[PDB]
Amino acid sequence: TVPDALKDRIALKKTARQLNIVYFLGSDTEPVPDYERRLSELLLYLQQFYGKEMQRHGYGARSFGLDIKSPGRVNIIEYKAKNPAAHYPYENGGGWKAAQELDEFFKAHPDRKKSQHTLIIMPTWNDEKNGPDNPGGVPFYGMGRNCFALDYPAFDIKHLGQKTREGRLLTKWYGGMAHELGHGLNLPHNHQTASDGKKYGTALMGSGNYTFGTSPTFLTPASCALLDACEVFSVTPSQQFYEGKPEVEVGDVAISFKGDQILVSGNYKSPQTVKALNVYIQDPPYAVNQDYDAVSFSRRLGKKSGKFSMKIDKKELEGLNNNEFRISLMFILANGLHMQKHFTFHWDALQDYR
Ligand SMILES: [Zn+2]
Ligand SMILES: [Zn+2]
């Protein structure tokens, strides 16, 4: 009743909002057997991973909230869809179609919606391409505050880390869920620093979807700074999330290069508290799926206005190898919105900025 992988687990702080879990069934789709237990175990272990990382970074035992209906059992919404499975495929807006239908379901049942974040899980298609040994066919990506992942018969934590086809399949699809959930929880891609890579392994939002459960995987300071400002990690019920627009004035920005060091400083002013500054340094190209390489840093601010100061060591920029690089400054607000400013440089023609 308790898998071995959950025997080591921490008590977590109650949160003001919880991640919704929807098991999304096409009108012609049968659940994968034993999904309530299998997915509860996997989700509770995922919750442990995120909560232990938040604690290790100084935020206390805070994870994404889950609605628990009995010991070891998540309150999963089993949703029977209006249309057959073929109507909500990975491609061509299948995920948006599912999400719109769930918007209708939550409008008609607002008691069952516990936050603005939802993880939708669909069973694998079973055809000539996909099946229990090669899951796929369904949405599998982040979509705003929503994210999509899948289920299949061996999607069971008992295989975690095992040197078997089931174990390798699990790290692929469980690591995948962990990473897509990160996107759903407002996380962009980022890469571990050189020092963190040596101590803690592979960043989950970098290539950690390939390592989760098999080799050491972790969450960066910058990811934890965003989770600190994510609705389902809130221990402050007075705080409302994601309303309005990010309003930050950023002035007197200086970026200077002195030996091996990158100096970043400036001032900020917001009507909201500014929780933190994340700094991302990456090689081109810069699209939202060409940024697995962005090495990230974070600094706590915690005021509505003030100055920021940061020295970044170039030797921590593990993996970067382009003459051209971009520094992004991301200001994270208390309501979970953020704004960014970008600056591009060239190592062979380094120009201090303002
Ligand atoms: Zn991703
Ligand atoms: Zn890049």
Numbering used by the authors: 27 to 380
What is the paper's account of this structure, in its own sentences?
Here we focus on OgpA from A. muciniphila, a recently discovered O-glycopeptidase that exclusively hydrolyzes the peptide bond N-terminal to serine or threonine residues substituted with an O-glycan. OgpAWT comprises two domains from the N- to the C-terminus: (i) a catalytic domain (residues 25–262) followed by (ii) a β-sandwich domain (residues 263-385). Interestingly, a Zn2+ atom coordinates with the side chains of three histidine residues, H205, H209, and H215, a highly conserved triad among metalloproteases. A glutamate residue, E206, is well-positioned to act as a general base/acid during catalysis.
The crystal structure of full-length OgpA in its unliganded form was solved using zinc single-wavelength anomalous dispersion (Zn-SAD). The high quality of the electron density maps allowed the trace of residues 27–380 (OgpAWT1) and 25 to 382 (OgpAWT2). The overall protein scaffold and the conformation of the OgpAWT1 and OgpAWT2 were essentially preserved (root mean square deviation, r.m.s.d., of 0.37 Å for 350 residues). However, the connecting loop α4–α5 (loop 9; residues 227–246) is unstructured in OgpAWT2 whereas in OgpAWT1 displays a short α-helix. Furthermore, we were unable to fully model the β7–β8 connecting loop (loop 12; residues 309–320) on OgpAWT2 crystal structure because it is disordered. A close inspection of the two crystal structures revealed that the protein crystallized as a monomer. The first β-sheet of the antiparallel β-sandwich domain consists of four β-strands with topology β6–β7–β8–β11, whereas the second β-sheet comprises four β-strands with topology β13–β12–β9–β10, with an overall size of 39 × 28 × 19 Å (“Methods” section). Both domains are separated by a long and open groove that runs parallel to the protein surface where the active site is located.
